[PDB]
Amino acid sequence: PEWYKSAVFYELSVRTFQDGNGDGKGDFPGLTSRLDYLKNLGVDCLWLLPWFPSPLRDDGYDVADYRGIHPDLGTLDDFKVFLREAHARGLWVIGDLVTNHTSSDHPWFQAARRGPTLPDGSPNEYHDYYVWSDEGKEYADTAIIFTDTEVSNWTLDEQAGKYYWHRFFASQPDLNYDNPKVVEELHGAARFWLDLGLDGFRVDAVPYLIEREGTSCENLPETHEILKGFRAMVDREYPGRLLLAEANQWPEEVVEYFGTEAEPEFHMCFNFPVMPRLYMSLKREDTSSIREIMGRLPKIPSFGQWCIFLRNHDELTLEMVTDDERAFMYAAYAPDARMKINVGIRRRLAPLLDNDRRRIELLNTVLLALPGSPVLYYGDEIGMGDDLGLPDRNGVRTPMQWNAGTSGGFSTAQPSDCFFPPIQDPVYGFGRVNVQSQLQDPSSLLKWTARQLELRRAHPAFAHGDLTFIETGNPAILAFTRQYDGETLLIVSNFAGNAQAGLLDLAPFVGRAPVTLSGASPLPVVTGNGQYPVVMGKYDYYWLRLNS
Amino acid sequence: PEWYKSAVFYELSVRTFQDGNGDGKGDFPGLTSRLDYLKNLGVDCLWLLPWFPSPLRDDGYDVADYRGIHPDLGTLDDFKVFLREAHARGLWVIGDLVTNHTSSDHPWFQAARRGPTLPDGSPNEYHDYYVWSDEGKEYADTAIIFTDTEVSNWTLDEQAGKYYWHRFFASQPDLNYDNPKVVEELHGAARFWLDLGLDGFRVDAVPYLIEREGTSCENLPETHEILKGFRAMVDREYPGRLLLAEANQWPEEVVEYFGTEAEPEFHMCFNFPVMPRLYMSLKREDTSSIREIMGRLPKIPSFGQWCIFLRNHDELTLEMVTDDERAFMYAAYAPDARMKINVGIRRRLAPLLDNDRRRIELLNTVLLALPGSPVLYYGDEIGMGDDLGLPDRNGVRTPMQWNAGTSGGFSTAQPSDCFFPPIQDPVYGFGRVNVQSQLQDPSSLLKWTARQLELRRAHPAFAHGDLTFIETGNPAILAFTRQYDGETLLIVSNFAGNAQAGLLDLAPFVGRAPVTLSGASPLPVVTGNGQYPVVMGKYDYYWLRLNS
């Protein structure tokens, strides 16, 4: 198999992970000094949030130079040694390629806003890197994504006298991919980093590249074509490098970002459709919507692999659920108004689950056992909280909590001098929630997480096996099998907060002896009609091999 | 039913619970400010370690004045206000009457050590308050209790020129209960507190009062006759007040401390027999010893109620298990030789269980579901640790951890000026483990404990029902019923660290459906031969009711 299929991913922001020089901002030297923590946690590939020069109006997704390091984070040389030290430790690392827009401070946009022509009269080559309109009436049938900030996707640029298109913030003008030179510029941006040894890219906001009148301006055939070009380029020029897409769309649309066997697109896509049903199914003590949504995902190409996650640096997105589910999710997980932002909930894993260790463990085990390669959000392995007093999505991006010392060990500077303030509340503060205390706690969440990944690593069927749901006869209980090589895993999960009883339909398994992945504790052999009675306590998970 | 049968007890030491005035010693005004906390926790009866004047060589169990309060803890006025406030909240409170011995600083012993006649000529009537010997050869077939410190139960007083008897420290001379003046000195000491409104006494070291040649000096009929005289006096003079015996013995001797219907002794005896077997059954993943030791206990009288506990101010005693059981307990629970003391193990509950919250919950459910009245040791409801740097058994007696501020909120005095230092390690220190953050944490051990005690209070069968074990077919799984009034409870606990299957013998309940105590979710109806298949995950507990 290709490496990304057995990998575990870990998502972190250089700026909030480890400060290495005392200024209160994370940097690449600080990240390099913590590589062994990631190695020993059991992660294979680091996904770094954007590291580029940037006025940071959207925390680095507003790029002002695709081929440099933001000053906060150190230098291109610090980047280079970090890669050397990550590779030397058997760590793949991928960056975040922001294709759809730049910062308004980018050189290109600064030129482009001068207008169609320079003062001397000659044409302005950069004007058509962006999307311009005289009165901003095109593409009127389009969602606004950042509903709490942006009232329109067109903004009047004072100096050009014309409106420009932006799907995200006004300070993030969209790039015009009907211009072949723009396409070549981003081919070039990609080459610069993949030449430095970078192992591939998370590609940001891929459904929004091209816009056509008469359409949603989403998942257009033509934006797929550009993405095919990207893949073709790294297939010819950088074989083995990974392309990973963030496409938060309904299932029938997401799978298309894999392309076909004859025209490949992305190697991997984030499984956005499962992520909200997982939470919904917890509060509802009914798992049918997990199965229903998994059932709508068509098959994927031979190279394709799902990327499973629970949380990330963004809000918990409710863009791709129904009206009723969104309302349900809000009342269940956003009791307080400030927890909402842009059709979504800006909260961390542990607080969403009320810090209930048995729920955190339950969801993680489902994460680790569904088809695909999982990605952990930094700090969830120790149970970090959120700071909802911070604006936008910053509340889920506070510093890594490494110990109980100053600023949680993230920095020698004081907490009020750090880029985001380390969390210090009684429940989630670095006095209570920190890496060093979990390395000494025999039963910490950190040790549970590392051990559960190790369990996963010893059973290839979690990464490569097919998936078949099992009936169970109780909505609160989810059951499926993973089959790969000659091993059949059976995994059973109780989403109710009390004991539940089920009747698993193991008719194909009559004669097989279920045993326990941890210690091979025997269960009764499947007999008769193969309808198998199980009782489970609250939020239990049964990880079982079905011996033949 | 008498109040002590449905009460929840809470054991605390006034010196280490809450300092009210900043001097580093807990006191009665500070304890008074925490009564609301105990009330909300779900406790009914406070049991206070000895609060009397004393030089504290044995942390107060060496009493120098049976009718005062130790100046560290406040005044008698402060005590009276505390008692008044405790009763205003519906709490009962029992004290600790040390009957076997006194401090060698007690004025009785100071008079006595002068010898049998005074220098003014006249005889010294205090000389016969204690047990003297000319050479110390008597009662030689008697064990030493504090084997680590004492080499003999006799000691030479230089002033007296004779040896004197002591089951515990040389600083705790045994009182002579063949002297009738000693019996009445302790009746009056009991009377003094009962007159103040104290609801009862825990009686220290009841097995060791009377010594006799040619015996173990243990459980002697004469010491039983004295206890019938303590009970007779409380029955005639103070109806409804509680007598509670600390008697660590094998089951057939422990039940004698209840007395009989005709000749009552104690209302309650600590169930020292099961306590070691709960811990043995966890590491063995085999519960048969719980059932056997439970079966060796005869019916107790109508007024009697067992007192169930997990840990206490002392070591986990191994004095009444077999040699094989004791070697297993040491290997399992005292990896470090320094955790052993006096045929026991000096560690707190959470450390014993490797800070494993699933194991802590399991033992606490079993503790709340066996027959009796549970007593909780202060601090185990938040998961405190121990300090092996403290001598003797002081490591389990460190100050209560209320919040993350100065000395964990116990005191405004710095940690090093508190009577015992508050724990500050990374796993168990008050920055991590404290009451305030567990009140703010919706899924804390403190909230779980209070919720569990609320579920137990909702089902009187726990406090008053009979007990019947049932087969299960797997030693790892323990199951029993409690039946009282119309209600039958069914409790199933898995002591193994991975998932386990069983087959429950439920023949007497065919046609009845087990339903969940928490959230009325019903399990399948009991059918056929009533052999009922269950699966259970690691350390699961099933609190169930059996319908009609």
Ligand SMILES: [Ca+2]
């Ligand atoms: Ca676009």
Ligand SMILES: [Ca+2]
């Ligand atoms: Ca004695």
Ligand SMILES: [Mg+2]
């Ligand atoms: Mg820095």
Ligand SMILES: [Mg+2]
């Ligand atoms: Mg004080």
